[PDB]
Amino acid sequence: EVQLLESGGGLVQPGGSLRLSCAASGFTFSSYAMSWVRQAPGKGLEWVSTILQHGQRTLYADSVKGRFTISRDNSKNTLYLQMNSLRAEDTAVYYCAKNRAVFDYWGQGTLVTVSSTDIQMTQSPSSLSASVGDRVTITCRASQSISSYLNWYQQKPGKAPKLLIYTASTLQSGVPSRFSGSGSGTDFTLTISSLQPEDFATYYCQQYRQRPPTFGQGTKVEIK
């Protein structure tokens, strides 16, 4: 129902510029905050920027501060991200996500290739091989107490991240009951009771007790 179509990415030389545009539809765009979150090749998710509602107020990550500029056009229901002085480190897949703390809807991601503290989250294991019907357990540990401000996201290969659990344990509307999130403080676990063939994906844990919100490196679930 809710669509977030991204465009504007591609391949650029170091020092160049790009403009990413995420056209949203299916919700009151002017009522929600919007965010850009990037994923480096073979790395975890990283929060880039957010624009809040009717405040014209921007929040940026320290690595992209001064170089990136987020903006929104409420008449077009579009979220723009102007990337300037692009470095080699900026090469990643950029997703536009809804809201500022709990990202319920994500874009499919657009690739940007450039060529010629806060709370840290650790997930366990980094990868695992299980069969259909098994019970899998993923552990998310926070460097400090984050209360119950924990989210679990499911990212299938090459697809957009999907919100599974929010506030440590509350299940997202539309998520099967086989998913269960539990834990508090600094220790959280995501358990899948009976694995399914479509369930093989990478699972990420995010915290929003501290801004900027940080993710884990991810937990890959493969076949045997």
Author numbering: 3 to 118, 134 to 241
What did the authors write?
The M2 is a proton-selective ion channel, and it plays a pivotal role in the uncoating of the viral core during entry and viral assembly. We selected a 10-mer conserved epitope of the N-terminal region of the M2 ectodomain as SLLTEVETPI (labeled U1) used for screening against the Tomlinson (I + J) scFv phage libraries.
The co-crystals of scFv AU1 with extended U1 peptide crystallized in the P212121 space group with five molecules of scFv in the asymmetric unit. Of the five scFv molecules, three are unliganded, and organized as one dimer and one monomer. The remaining two molecules exist as a dimer with a peptide dimer at scFv dimeric interface. Distinct CDR orientations in liganded scFvs allows accommodation of the peptide at scFv interface in the form of a wider groove with extensive scFv-peptide interactions. Interestingly the two peptide molecules are present in parallel dimer orientation at the interface of the two scFv molecules. They were stabilized by backbone hydrogen bonds providing a twisted parallel beta-sheet conformation to the peptide dimer. Thus, the two scFvs capture the peptide epitope in a dimeric parallel ß-sheet conformation perhaps trapping the entire membrane bound M2 protein in dimeric form with physiological consequences.
